[PDB]
Amino acid sequence: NIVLAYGEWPEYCPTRPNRFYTLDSKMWQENSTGWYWKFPDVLNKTGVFGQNAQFHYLYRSGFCLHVQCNASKFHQGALLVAVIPEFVIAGRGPHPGFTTTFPGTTGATFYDPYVLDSGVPLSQALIYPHQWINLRTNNCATVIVPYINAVPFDSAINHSNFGLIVIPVSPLKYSSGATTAIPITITIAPLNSEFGGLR
Amino acid sequence: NIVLAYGEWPEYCPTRPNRFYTLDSKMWQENSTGWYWKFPDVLNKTGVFGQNAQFHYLYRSGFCLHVQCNASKFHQGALLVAVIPEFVIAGRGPHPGFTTTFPGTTGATFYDPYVLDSGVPLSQALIYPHQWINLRTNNCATVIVPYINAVPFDSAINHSNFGLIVIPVSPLKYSSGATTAIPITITIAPLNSEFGGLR
Amino acid sequence: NIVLAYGEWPEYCPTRPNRFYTLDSKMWQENSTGWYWKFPDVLNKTGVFGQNAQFHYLYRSGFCLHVQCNASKFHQGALLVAVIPEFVIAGRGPHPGFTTTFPGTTGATFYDPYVLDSGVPLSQALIYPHQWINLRTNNCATVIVPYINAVPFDSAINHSNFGLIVIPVSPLKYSSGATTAIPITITIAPLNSEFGGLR
Amino acid sequence: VETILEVNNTTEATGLTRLLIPVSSQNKADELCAAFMVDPGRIGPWQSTLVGQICRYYTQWSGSLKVTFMFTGSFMATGKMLVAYSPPGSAQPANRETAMLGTHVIWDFGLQSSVSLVIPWISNAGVVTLWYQTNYVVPPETPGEAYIIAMGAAQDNFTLKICKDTD
Amino acid sequence: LETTINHFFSRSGLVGVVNLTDTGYATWDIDIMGFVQLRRKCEMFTYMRFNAEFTFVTTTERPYMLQYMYVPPGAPKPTGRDAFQWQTATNPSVFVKLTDPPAQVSVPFMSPASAYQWFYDGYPTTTYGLCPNNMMGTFAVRVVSREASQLKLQTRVYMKLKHVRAWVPRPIRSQPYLLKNFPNYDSITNSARDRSSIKQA
Numbered sequence: 001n002i003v004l005a006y007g008e009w010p011e012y013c014p015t016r017p018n019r020f021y022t023l024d025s026k027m028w029q030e031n032s033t034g035w036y037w038k039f040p041d042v043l044n045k046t047g048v049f050g051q052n053a054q055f056h057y058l059y060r061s062g063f064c065l066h067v068q069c070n071a072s073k074f075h076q077g078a079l080l081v082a083v084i085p086e087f088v089i090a091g092r093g094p095h096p097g098f099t100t101t102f103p104g105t106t107g108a109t110f111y112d113p114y115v116l117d118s119g120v121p122l123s124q125a126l127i128y129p130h131q132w133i134n135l136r137t138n139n140c141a142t143v144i145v146p147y148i149n150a151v152p153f154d155s156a157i158n159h160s161n162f163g164l165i166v167i168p169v170s171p172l173k174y175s176s177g178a179t180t181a182i183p184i185t186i187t188i189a190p191l192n193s194e195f196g197g198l199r
Numbered sequence: 200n201i202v203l204a205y206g207e208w209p210e211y212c213p214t215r216p217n218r219f220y221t222l223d224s225k226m227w228q229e230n231s232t233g234w235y236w237k238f239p240d241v242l243n244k245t246g247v248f249g250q251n252a253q254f255h256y257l258y259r260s261g262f263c264l265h266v267q268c269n270a271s272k273f274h275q276g277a278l279l280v281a282v283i284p285e286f287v288i289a290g291r292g293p294h295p296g297f298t299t300t301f302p303g304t305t306g307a308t309f310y311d312p313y314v315l316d317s318g319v320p321l322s323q324a325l326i327y328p329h330q331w332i333n334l335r336t337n338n339c340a341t342v343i344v345p346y347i348n349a350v351p352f353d354s355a356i357n358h359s360n361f362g363l364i365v366i367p368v369s370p371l372k373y374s375s376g377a378t379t380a381i382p383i384t385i386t387i388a389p390l391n392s393e394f395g396g397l398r
Numbered sequence: 399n400i401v402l403a404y405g406e407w408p409e410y411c412p413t414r415p416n417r418f419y420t421l422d423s424k425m426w427q428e429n430s431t432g433w434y435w436k437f438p439d440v441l442n443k444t445g446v447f448g449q450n451a452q453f454h455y456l457y458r459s460g461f462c463l464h465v466q467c468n469a470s471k472f473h474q475g476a477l478l479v480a481v482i483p484e485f486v487i488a489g490r491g492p493h494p495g496f497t498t499t500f501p502g503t504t505g506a507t508f509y510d511p512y513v514l515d516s517g518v519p520l521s522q523a524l525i526y527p528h529q530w531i532n533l534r535t536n537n538c539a540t541v542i543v544p545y546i547n548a549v550p551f552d553s554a555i556n557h558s559n560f561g562l563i564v565i566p567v568s569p570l571k572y573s574s575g576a577t578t579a580i581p582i583t584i585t586i587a588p589l590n591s592e593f594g595g596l597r
Numbered sequence: 598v599e600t601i602l603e604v605n606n607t608t609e610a611t612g613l614t615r616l617l618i619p620v621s622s623q624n625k626a627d628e629l630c631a632a633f634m635v636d637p638g639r640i641g642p643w644q645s646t647l648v649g650q651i652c653r654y655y656t657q658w659s660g661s662l663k664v665t666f667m668f669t670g671s672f673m674a675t676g677k678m679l680v681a682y683s684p685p686g687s688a689q690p691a692n693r694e695t696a697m698l699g700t701h702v703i704w705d706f707g708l709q710s711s712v713s714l715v716i717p718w719i720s721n722a723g724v725v726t727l728w729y730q731t732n733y734v735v736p737p738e739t740p741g742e743a744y745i746i747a748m749g750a751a752q753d754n755f756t757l758k759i760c761k762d763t764d
Numbered sequence: 765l766e767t768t769i770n771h772f773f774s775r776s777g778l779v780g781v782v783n784l785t786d787t788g789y790a791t792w793d794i795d796i797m798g799f800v801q802l803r804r805k806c807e808m809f810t811y812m813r814f815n816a817e818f819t820f821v822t823t824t825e826r827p828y829m830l831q832y833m834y835v836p837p838g839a840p841k842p843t844g845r846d847a848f849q850w851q852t853a854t855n856p857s858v859f860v861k862l863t864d865p866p867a868q869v870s871v872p873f874m875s876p877a878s879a880y881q882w883f884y885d886g887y888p889t890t891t892y893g894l895c896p897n898n899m900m901g902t903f904a905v906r907v908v909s910r911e912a913s914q915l916k917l918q919t920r921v922y923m924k925l926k927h928v929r930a931w932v933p934r935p936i937r938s939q940p941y942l943l944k945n946f947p948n949y950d951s952i953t954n955s956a957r958d959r960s961s962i963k964q965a
Contacts, residue, residue: 218698219703220697221679221697221701221703221730223626223627223693223694223730224626224677224730224731224732226626226732245694246698269675269676269677269705269706269707269731269734270675270734271673271674271675271734271735271736272673272736273673273736273737274736304694338707373737374737375737376736376737376738377735377736377737378622378732378733378734378735378741380732381732381734382626382677382731382732382734384677384730384731386703
């Protein structure tokens with residue numbers, strides 16, 4: 001069921017400070033094309049973690065995710081939940097800017113999903129720890145992500161550890177009379193956070 | 200679940216030569232009226248068994264059947280799978296001919312199902328090993344048939360051991376918008392074949 | 399008596415499917431000059447082996463041969479039964495073609511036997527497993543041939559494993575009144591065949 | 598690693614719609630839904646997967662590839678498929694009957710949502726198809742179109758030989 | 765009990781009615797499918813096996829030495845009352861006077877297959893469903909005199925079935941049939957007689 005990213009169970013070896021956060025649910029239409037979030041940025045200016053990541057400039061944590069979409073038995077389609085480390089938006093054309101690369105809690109959208117906006121084709125995106133949300137089998141997906149970085153610490157504001165992508169591969173078709181949009185809610189919980197140094 | 204025809208588990212007491220064959224699925228409409236096949240004729244000119252029944256003129260085998268129709272939860276109706284030994288088409292009016300009595304893999308259809316085209320009323324057809332395919336309980340049926348003949352051997356081409364009938368007793372009703380036809384696929388596997396003599 | 403080709407007793411290490419085949423007897427006159435057959439081609443379109451070599455495209459077998467000519471006590475002459483691996487017709491003059499290299503069951507004839515139609519002189523042809531049919535000592539010859547190939551498998555149609563040659567070294571002389579021709583019949587039996595893959 | 602295989606690589610595909618095989622609801626029985634060669638390295642369907650990129654290196658390959666499908670319809674739909682296969686001796690079959698005699702796997706929809714198929718011992722063709730073998734059955738007020746995306750991977754005995762630069 | 769299958773066949777009913785003029789003789793094929801009371805009770809099953817015994821009852825309109833020959837299946841049938849088939853010793857015949865109490869004889873089970881088949885679906889290679897392994901023979905009743913019989917006699921043939929064993933059943937016939945040895949029915953009558961409505965039993 002659950003998918004350990006590379007099999008770690010993230011422990012830690014600077015104090016050691018777990019509420020289930022809930023991002024705001026995106027609506028999924030017929031002509032939608034995907035989303036991405038770039039953790040651990042979206043937890044900033046939010047909650048007690050936001051007061052622990054904005055003032056401290058060393059950081060290490062691991063996460064537990066739960067992507068869950070609720071659909072009735074009269075819809076169809078299949079998503080793709082992948083967790084990409086060091087996920088870099090390329091920029092078309094000419095650099096992409098700042099409000100495109102750090103979207104905050106409102107996760108930004110894609111332009112060209114076939115190349116993942118980085119020249120990397122989607123056919124091979126399953127190297128990353130993936131989990132198919134197929135709407136005729138289940139309605140949930142759960143990924144546990146350890147702390148994946150070369151240096152054992154970093155700043156919380158600048159460097160993003162990884163990203164989370166949600167891509168509609170097969171488009172949503174529905175007979176007339178049903179609701180047009182399907183929500184997608186996400187749950188984020190830090191597992192073993194360990195901050196250091198106060199400013 | 201499965202129905203042994205008269206409780207045999209067909210063994211054998213001439214060499215002893217099992218692929219799951221699959222006949223082509225018939226479409227079932229509202230005004231359809233039934234089908235029949237007359238084994239072991241339909242396995243001729245088909246597969247390695249066809250190359251073992253056309254050249255050899257002594258024969259003994261038993262069969263395992265699997266009649267399976269796939270219907271959604273918005274249809275209704277009930278079929279009737281019976282296995283009649285020495286099933287003889289009578290002929291109306293005036294003998295029926297040849298392409299009516301040996302239909303090949305395309306199983307022929309009925310004219311008057313109420314009398315089974317032999318003067319035998321359908322009310323008493325459950326003497327034979329029967330199995331109700333009721334479309335609100337299941338979608339499969341399985342009959343195992345031994346070798347039922349007075350002489351211990353026969354030719355494969357001429358003499359038919361038995362027949363298989365599929366009769367829509369309650370007609371299929373469906374609300375508008377659903378698909379008009381429902382397929383019926385059949386699986387045939389020889390159990391203990393034992394041929395003899397090569398020509 | 400019997401001559402093992404290089405001493406193997408051919409075992410095998412893809413299913414594992416032995417009738418004594420009999421090729422059609424060639425007539426040997428005064429001015430005849432030899433024959434060749436190029437196994438395992440001549441068993442194609444013949445018998446149950448032909449239905450197992452035309453449909454399967456991997457192959458391994460060994461053979462047992464029996465070349466036998468029946469002559470009375472008033473004739474004379476001596477043949478030469480040799481088994482040449484990878485026997486290649488050269489072509490005079492300008493490639494030889496197809497109906498010359500693959501003769502089928504009617505084994506093709508020689509043009510110049512002194513050089514074996516390949517530039518190889520007959521004086522040294524006894525390197526191959528040979529057996530003299532001298533018509534004042536015996537009337538039979540028997541060669542057992544294993545599977546001799548670099549790759550452990552091949553196709554049955556394209557690649558020929560070896561060839562069988564029959565050469566009249568001393569010509570046949572006979573006093574007047576005797577029969578002009580002497581037959582030569584050949585028996586072929588596969589020893590350990592092992593096919594693989596069906597098309 | 599099972600990666601997504603491009604099958605619908607026609608001219609008019611143009612986007613994510615080339616990652617999926619269409620399944621109608623008006624196709625008559627036994628008409629070929631899709632067909633492609635089993636050739637990790639030749640210019641075609643395998644050129645998008647992860648096998649097809651790391652075998653543009655390593656000139657000589659040999660092994661046992663497997664092919665996985667999965668279905669993307671509503672829960673109420675029900676049908677069957679006949680995933681067939683032929684050895685590289687012959688071409689693809691024509692009818693449902695002459696394809697049934699091979700290495701078929703009768704895959705349906707009401708029970709299983711995914712199926713695999715083990716292809717034995719390729720080297721440096723072999724053709725896989727899939728046939729309908731029944732109608733595609735829908736209840737009313739249900740969209741009657743779905744797609745089947747394919748996968749691709751290599752099992753344990755998949756070995757390589759002499760290195761070679763790519764493209 | 766009396767619902768066992770041996771008691772269900774153990775009555776000796778009429779089969780065929782044969783009369784002879786003086787031609788001079790009269791033959792009769794053996795078949796149980798002559799009357800509808802015995803056909804509906806014997807298309808019940810598919811495979812049967814039984815020995816039979818007979819009885820010949822003679823009604824003129826004194827005693828003569830009339831005989832009853834028997835033809836095993838394969839032997840040729842007589843053509844005239846003074847042909848050479850009447851003296852072949854391989855045909856077992858029964859000499860019985862008129863005024864005596866009636867003749868009685870048993871017949872063993874002669875089919876080549878283990879049991880008789882009342883339904884065959886195939887061919888011997890209009891020849892559909894005619895299994896030749898149901899032949900049981902004739903009787904060829906003949907009055908014996910040197911010439912000029914002049915009786916105008918009529919015989920009746922009864923039949924009892926013994927030691928019978930039946931295999932796989934079939935449902936009964938529900939319609940009258942036209943031909944003698946075929947189930948042709950000329951499409952239709954129902955099975956249950958009608959009433960007024962679905963209610964009101």
